[PDB]
Amino acid sequence: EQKTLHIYNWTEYIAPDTVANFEKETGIKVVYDVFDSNEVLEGKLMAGSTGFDLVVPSAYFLERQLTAGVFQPLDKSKLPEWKNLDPELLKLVAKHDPDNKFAMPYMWATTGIGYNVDKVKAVLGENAPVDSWDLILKPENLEKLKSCGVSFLDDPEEVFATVLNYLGKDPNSTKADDYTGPATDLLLKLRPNIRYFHSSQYINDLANGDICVAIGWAGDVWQASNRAKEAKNGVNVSFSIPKEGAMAWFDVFAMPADAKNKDEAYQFLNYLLRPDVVAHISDHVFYANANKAATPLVSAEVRENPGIYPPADVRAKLFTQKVQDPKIDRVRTRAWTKVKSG
Ligand SMILES: [Cl-]
């Protein structure tokens, strides 16, 4: 009569005592495993027989697998606190997961600009355009910021979509020439001023003062900012969702089709739906959760931060990723190699 539950989630994406609290309440043995690379997660899910009862993919990946039999539909009768989830956010996630059949939204954020407040102002002045992609996508600005250090993500899907939106095009353009032409043109003009393309080095580099501007995931940047504060190192890190808009994305809990410990998994999911549980997570990880009942319980410093919980005018400028034809996938990979070579 041992009860067990196997979970696979991102690093830095739960509160330190969430699992311990759940174990004390339920008597379930939780085996909590972490990944730091989306490629690692998706490769395991596609191979199957992962041994996980719960996993945390992107809503975008879930869309790609809706007919592949990777996941199983969630039994809402075992999730009595489902009503706490924000219907407005559920509708957006339903673009990827019709009728919210497979996924329980967990946390969500944007891809924006993380930056060192003091260094940016030293280089570009007090009126530096921190509210705009101009800060890092105007070559004249990036040339000045080069010495204090510029990082881009190593993700052509996010970066091309960001550049296309900045150029006034469909962020999800289906036209190959938009990628190989104007988007690559701008990226090649910026390239000489970019120190590196990497998925995670920018977090600690922002916190320690080694880079001054980065394309980054909001909550990871806010984590860096908090780490700098705790270190009492004088580094002031902030984050901007720029005025031209930005990519929004949603991390979700889902259940592999071969999950064994289904009752325990639903217990954990409904535990996450308790307002104080997920509010406590957001307090620790600096990400907005999808639970509207939880918002008033989140610490004021987090819920009042419009780069974590953006208001309606900002949300209306955000775009989400669409699935492309594989021809466009290959275009993006080829063009990204060209960009990075310079
Ligand atoms: Cl997503």
Author numbering: 28 to 369
What did the article's authors report about this structure?
Hence, the focus shifted toward D247S, the wildtype Asp bears one of two major carboxyl groups important in primary amine coordination upon ligand binding and recognition in PotF. We introduced the S247D exchange into PotF/D and into our high-affinity constructs E39D–Y87S–F88Y and E39D–F88A/L. PotF/D–S247D showed an improved SPD affinity in the regime of the first-round salt bridge construct (KD(SPD) ≈ 9.4 μM; Table 2). Nonetheless, all constructs regained PUT affinity in the medium to low micromolar range. This was expected as we reintroduced the wildtype-like proximal primary amine–binding site in these variants. All structures but PotF/D–S247D adopt a fully closed wildtype conformation. All in all, we determined salt bridges and the key carboxyl-harboring proximal residue D247 as the basic prerequisites for a complete closure of PotF constructs. Fixing each component by itself was not sufficient. Only the combination of both allows full closure, deeming it an intricately regulated process.
